[PDB]
Amino acid sequence: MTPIEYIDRALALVVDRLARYPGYEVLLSAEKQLQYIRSVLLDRSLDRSALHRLTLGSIAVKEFDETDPELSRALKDAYYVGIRTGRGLKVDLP
Amino acid sequence: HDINYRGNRETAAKFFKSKDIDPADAESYMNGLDFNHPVRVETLAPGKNLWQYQSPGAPQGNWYTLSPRVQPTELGINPMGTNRAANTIEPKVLNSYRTTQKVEVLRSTAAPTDDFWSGGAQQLFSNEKGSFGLLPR
């Protein structure tokens, strides 16, 4: 997947899970963070300071590692896209 | 980040690698820790009581608290979880465990939950699930 595809994959899963659990704050937070990553991937002129305030990785492992491994995987990968982007490094995912 | 923060990050990175987490995923596990506070590896002896929040209907996880008085938010978790069979949001359950074997754990302070996208408590991490026995609730 391209980096945007990893973010849109995670957003697809978050939206699917919000239909199962409407209003669930963990998922609303994850959506907002994914949209932020998406924005900075698409436009390099936007401020990137908030990349170091992401909690998506923590959400993946503390909320979903047992209950939703599919979502946890997508959030781990999206978090990795975010932090590699913030650190100026290639997104070296397949 | 300063020399202490970088050392705490390296302690965590080394620990997660040794417990079969690859480097990209290890970043997410590290995102659960606040490297501005000490991160240390300890070995627990058998007989240590610990607690763990879990969604209802979910199996054992990897994160533990040292006391049943610690609340979810300070641990970086939501007080509500997911009941998958019922498709409902319901309070997390607090389960009790006791170490059954000597086991190495990563001790740190949580990155706790604040309102940016809307103090931290201490936590232990171990993915050696069989070293922590579920107690009656």
Swiss-Prot record, chain A:
It comes from the Bacteria. Pfam families: Tsi6 (PF18660). GO terms for biological process: protein secretion by the type VI secretion system. InterPro entries: Tsi6 (IPR040818). One of its GO terms (molecular function) is toxin sequestering activity. Coiled coil: none annotated. Disruption phenotype: Deletion mutant cells show Tse6-dependent intoxication with a dramatic increase in division time. Immunity protein that plays a role in preventing early activation of toxin Tse6. This is Immune protein Tsi6. It comes from Pseudomonas aeruginosa (strain ATCC 15692 / DSM 22644 / CIP 104116 / JCM 14847 / LMG 12228 / 1C / PRS 101 / PAO1). The gene is tsi6.
Curated annotation (Swiss-Prot), chain B:
It comes from the Bacteria. It is found in: Membrane. Interacts with Tsi6, VgrG1a, EagT6 and EF-Tu. Type VI secretion exported toxin that acts as a glycohydrolase on bacterial target cells and degrades the essential dinucleotides NAD(+) and NADP(+), thereby inducing bacteriostasis. The activity resides in the C-terminal region that is initially neutralized by the cognate immunity protein Tsi6. This is NAD(P)(+) glycohydrolase toxin Tse6. It comes from Pseudomonas aeruginosa (strain ATCC 15692 / DSM 22644 / CIP 104116 / JCM 14847 / LMG 12228 / 1C / PRS 101 / PAO1). The gene is tse6.
